[PDB]
Design an enzyme around this catalytic site. Sequence first.
Site, short mmCIF file in Angstrom:
data_model
loop_
_atom_site.label_atom_id
_atom_site.label_comp_id
_atom_site.label_asym_id
_atom_site.label_seq_id
_atom_site.Cartn_x
_atom_site.Cartn_y
_atom_site.Cartn_z
N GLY A 28 -6.66 0.88 -3.43
CA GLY A 28 -6.34 1.57 -4.65
C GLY A 28 -6.98 0.91 -5.83
O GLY A 28 -7.73 0.28 -5.54
N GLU A 45 -2.22 -0.92 5.48
CA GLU A 45 -1.57 -1.66 4.63
C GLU A 45 -0.49 -2.47 5.19
O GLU A 45 -0.50 -3.70 5.31
CB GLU A 45 -1.38 -1.06 3.52
CG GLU A 45 -2.25 -0.36 2.59
CD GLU A 45 -1.66 0.42 1.55
OE1 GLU A 45 -0.60 0.47 1.39
OE2 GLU A 45 -2.63 1.05 0.93
#
Lengths: 215, 216
Positions: free
Chosen positions: A27, A101
């Site tokens: 991100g 993640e």
Amino acid sequence: MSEAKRLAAEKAIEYVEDGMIVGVGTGSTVAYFIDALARIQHRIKGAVSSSEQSTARLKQHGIEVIELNHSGNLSLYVDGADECDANKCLIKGGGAALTREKIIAEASERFICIIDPSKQVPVLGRFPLPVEVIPMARSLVARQIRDMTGGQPTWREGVVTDNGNQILDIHNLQITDPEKLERELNQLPGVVCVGLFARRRADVVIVGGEPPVVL
Amino acid sequence: HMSEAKRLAAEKAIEYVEDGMIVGVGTGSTVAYFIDALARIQHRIKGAVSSSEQSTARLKQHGIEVIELNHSGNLSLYVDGADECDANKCLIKGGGAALTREKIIAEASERFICIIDPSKQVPVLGRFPLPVEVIPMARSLVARQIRDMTGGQPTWREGVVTDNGNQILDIHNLQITDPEKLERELNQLPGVVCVGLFARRRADVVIVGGEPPVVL
């Protein structure tokens, strides 16, 4: 919030130790951490990457990317969050990378979560909860989540994760018990990953600012 | 050896098919007899929802319409086999690597009929290793975790890829006396796609093939 993101990412660099294989999130906040890690790459062994996007960014800086199956367990994972509550429980998956993640975080001794102040919320759920689903299970899971939570699942139509799956975003929840909701949603056949980090939440939360606040 | 028992179990399962149904269809050698039996009553069904690309090919070869679960919605009936079935109707499934879509369709179905030959009846699940579908990049992590949590021995079913693109760990040496508890625990591990225990949602009816079949 660009400056807050950069300041949080630079503080997270203080947790990187010589010789580490660093677990790397995904991100826009993590982008600043990747840039900062590149400046100290002579001190690290490499990185394990939570997304193909992050892998390309690490490689663009010359950082060696290593598979988790090869590294084994890690000491440190650094990633962002879409929301973080006062108990350090998170909503993640706004960029559809929640599954890798969550796997890398699980394999890491400490998860340092880098955020700007807009990510701090008292009750998770204004940001819709991402759930990765097997495509042929999508409508079934949507019905079950609606029945269990009263929330409104919406298909993030057209998005395909790095694992080939779809995303349902669950709107309108007040997730006051993320430990319980994560455990219950994990039981549904066809759910690949739930974007709640609660069973294994952030160990450290760095809120960007001058100076960063470390929780 | 067990071919006649498999055939007879599938025959009995046909008695549960009601005219107009969309039938949920499992995978494997016992289900193969059920697919061939469905073909004999194809004029009485609307179609089938299929748990594997293999079963889809077998249904289509007989001219049965294969419908996506997203389109059918919930079903009244799902018929599938099992690698093991305990006395409480908890199952080990996934010997053929299709456990994930099987579990999804079973979850969407009101009645799950499990067709087995007598060799599948066990007092305690686990002699047949428990399949677990895993995200490939999580494989070694999940193996370590399952070893630590259960004391069993995970082995990669190396080279096998499921219809969903994932790998399989087979967990050896467990004596699974509380299948619902183990299923719930393994479902919490990031990187686990599906656990081959059907316990939270188990078989509603177990048909053991024989002359005549035994309905349990």
